[PDB]
Design a protein around this ligand. Sequence first.
Ligand code: NA
Lengths: 451, 451
Amino acid sequence: KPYRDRFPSHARLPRAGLPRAEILAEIAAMGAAESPAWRDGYASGAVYHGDEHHIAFLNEVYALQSQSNPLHPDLWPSTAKFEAEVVAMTAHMLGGDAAGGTVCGTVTSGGTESLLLAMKTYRDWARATKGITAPEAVVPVSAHAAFDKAAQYFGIKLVRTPLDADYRADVAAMREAITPNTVVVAGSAPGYPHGVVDPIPEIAALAAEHGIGCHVDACLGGFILPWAERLGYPVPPFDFRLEGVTSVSADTHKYGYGAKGTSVILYRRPDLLHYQYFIAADWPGGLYFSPTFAGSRPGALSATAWAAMLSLGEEGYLDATRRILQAADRLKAGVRAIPSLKILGDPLWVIAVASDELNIYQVMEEMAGRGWRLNGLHRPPAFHVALTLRHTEPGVVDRFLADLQDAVAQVRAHPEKATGMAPVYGMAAAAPPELVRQVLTGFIDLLYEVH
Amino acid sequence: IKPYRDRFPSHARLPRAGLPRAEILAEIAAMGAAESPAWRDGYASGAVYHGDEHHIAFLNEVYALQSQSNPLHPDLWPSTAKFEAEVVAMTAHMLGGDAAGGTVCGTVTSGGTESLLLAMKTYRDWARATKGITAPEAVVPVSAHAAFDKAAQYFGIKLVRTPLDADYRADVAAMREAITPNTVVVAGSAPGYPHGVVDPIPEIAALAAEHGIGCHVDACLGGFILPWAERLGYPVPPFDFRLEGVTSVSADTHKYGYGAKGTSVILYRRPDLLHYQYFIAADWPGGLYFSPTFAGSRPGALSATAWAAMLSLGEEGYLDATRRILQAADRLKAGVRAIPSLKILGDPLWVIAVASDELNIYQVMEEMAGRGWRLNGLHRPPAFHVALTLRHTEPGVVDRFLADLQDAVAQVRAHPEKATGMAPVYGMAAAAPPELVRQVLTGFIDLLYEV
Ligand code: NA
């Protein structure tokens, strides 16, 4: 709570309205304080484009569409066109034409919502068409935490399966975990922890053999992998090119470079998509439907997804991806050169680094002391850096490597040193899950404290 | 209908080369010039709640300043964590939170629907953990939002809908009779969407408390009006945390809070309830992970607009806006009651459902549509409503409505069998079997997404 001193806190409505100009000044001052961290490339992920002109462009898209609520297609036909076109272009980018032109889907609020919708959809589809009432889903331990959210929300038993030596899903273990109640298996393309792409072709084949769904979580890779493939990088098919793939999520607000608050969920056929829709026919409020979880939605954010995709085009995504993967190549070579560190698996641009000899959490804390905001991992202990366009700016990768070399030297010199956040991550890694839940619950409460 | 089919190019695939930003903006701007008059000039029921150009420009600048905000990372955007904390605190205080003894707490959500879903899930989880209930039920009036059915279907809750009395308010005897040992929550609306009437919250809350179950007040529509209507001397029963048995309340900042679309608030009487809402993952290799609500990544700029709107209005601003809306409603209601063949359903303050026992109300509505009005068509029983906003408090707007409504009724009286445009559509939807409605609406959503 860094502003507790500098700015008044508001626990109650002001009696009189406060001047707009004063309100904007506070927000602008906070922006000046907060933006350097992501602008200058210190943040893993978080901001995916970050360019001044791109941002000013999407801000004006927002301004022009600010009143849009896609719950009312009759008032905002513009926004329904934008969502239809985002879905179509994304589907085409992800091998939709290979499905025979039946690929369809919706815009969502984010990768989490795309995953939740897909999970609910397989649940309802399986109940209706296979008589399954105690649904199960099989995913690798690396699959996003949102799969557990979906499981707990929709009453699906989540079975998480082990990874091989390369941190990719062990498909044999996935086959073993399938039962008559399994409704879907998933693979990540790539997974968030270690940036590796699961063996999608085998997972898709597994699913098809069992007549169950196969969801590919391409939230992180959907706007990168197709371009990496065209640039010559090693990437096997991960999308609708695979016969057994029945849905794919992809985040326009990650490497699509749209504004935060949008993603896409795609299904192989409409008969599947139809299980996602909510329709109420008996309500005194009249006919009511929604394609996704929300009722009212900020249509302006859909406009920003559409605008971003159109302003980039294939050549734009190709260039962005090129820059990111070149930076990644350079970063990975540097990490491999530093003694006592290793990279987990063989990632293209989301790089998890670990150490068998040193406390990786203190190496991470040493980086944080130099301004870096990296993601702390566990199982196993590691940190990761998800490279973005912010990291392709001049000097950024070199600063990272220089800082990391220094971090490692400092930790080797005092291997028992543990400061700042390092003991927090270490304790969290060792702690019983229930204890973690209690403490993190207290933490969320603290974020909401007004003093 | 898709108005831009022949006016602008359609995009089924990414352009090969990025298109100029300036052209993309021109196209979006052109669509805005086409679309804004309808809401700006007061023709839309609900839809746009403030709509003033200076207010809008103000929020658009709030968005610009916070555009990169993603509250999944409070360490990068402490500004936004502060905004959400203060939106919750101010809203809680406005809704009688101090009467709870200072234990009232909550979170910002993406909208009214998410607030309702979250409350529903929360009572389900709470009841499972503390009451051993594994086949949860919820009892709500038939007028309660369609979103209650979404929550029931998502989270495996049996939803029991109960009849209204002659004033279109919840029949509390029927709710009592519907309670079983598996019931986890009862709800009332403040006010309900269809007819704008406030349920007997005190009786419902007392019912709930007597049974040791939750009581959720859906104040999504009324939360930012009712407290001020009450201060102004209008007849409004207590409906909030002043009532002992009220355990949660939802209120929409993006409705009469005058924030931008994409925000709402869910409040709980105590932290031990709120804690059942949080998602926490402790064994994920992606590290410690938590979400206070459904989403992971979120558009923090939208929370900023809620906060800024609340601050720029203050109590005086909400009091003034509410006064204007309620006096416009008073005038509008009197004018409708003065028209021989029309009646208003129940006794609403500002969301007015109008019906007719003698004429086809759907054609009356169609005659209004031919004059530019975008009203909401209801059924059970047939009616239309107008949810009055600041847009309808502008000079001449209520007078135009009544003048148009008088001509509408004169025309229908002259040709009682006339049924044109959307009138036969609403008429058929009201008579049609729900399964048939489901199939047709499913086809309609498909139509929205056609490129
Ligand atoms: Na190394």
